[PDB]
């Protein structure tokens, strides 16, 4: 069910991460998963790869969390995929 505590983690994204962060206004070197969860989330709808699973293969994100796609619903496969691209702080 996760903990509320999560989202306060503070995080440098690695290189690929930061540069698709970036594309949605990002500027920082260190962010809170929250301000993380929002981004990658603005990502997902500009860019239409969701309408309840998210369609990376053709996109950076797919390369990124290694998956042609994957359900909004698996909270804790998403968090996974995440930290794969960053360093906690
Ligand atoms: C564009 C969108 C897919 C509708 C946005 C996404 N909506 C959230 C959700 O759970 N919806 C169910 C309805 N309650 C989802 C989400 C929110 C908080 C924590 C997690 Cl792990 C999460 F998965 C969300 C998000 O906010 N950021 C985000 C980032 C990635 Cl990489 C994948 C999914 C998301």
Redo the contacts with the bound molecule.
């Keep these: 069910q ?1 903990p509320a505590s999560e ?1 306060e983690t503070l995080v440098r994204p690695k290189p690929l991460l930061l540069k698709l962060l970036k594309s949605v206004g990002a500027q920082k070197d260190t962010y809170t ?1 929250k301000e ?3 981004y ?6 500009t860019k239409r ?2 309408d ?1 699973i ?1 369609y990376c293969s053709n996109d950076l ?1 797919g390369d990124l ?1 290694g998956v042609p796609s ?1 359900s ?5 496969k ?2 996974t ?2 930290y794969r691209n960053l360093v906690v702080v």
Excluded: A, D, P, S
């Excluded at 909004?72 to 804790?76: A, C």
């Design positions: 996760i989202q998963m993380v969860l929002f990658l989330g603005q990502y997902i709808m790869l969701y309840h998210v994100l969390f994957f909004v619903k698996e909270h804790r998403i968090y995929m995440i």
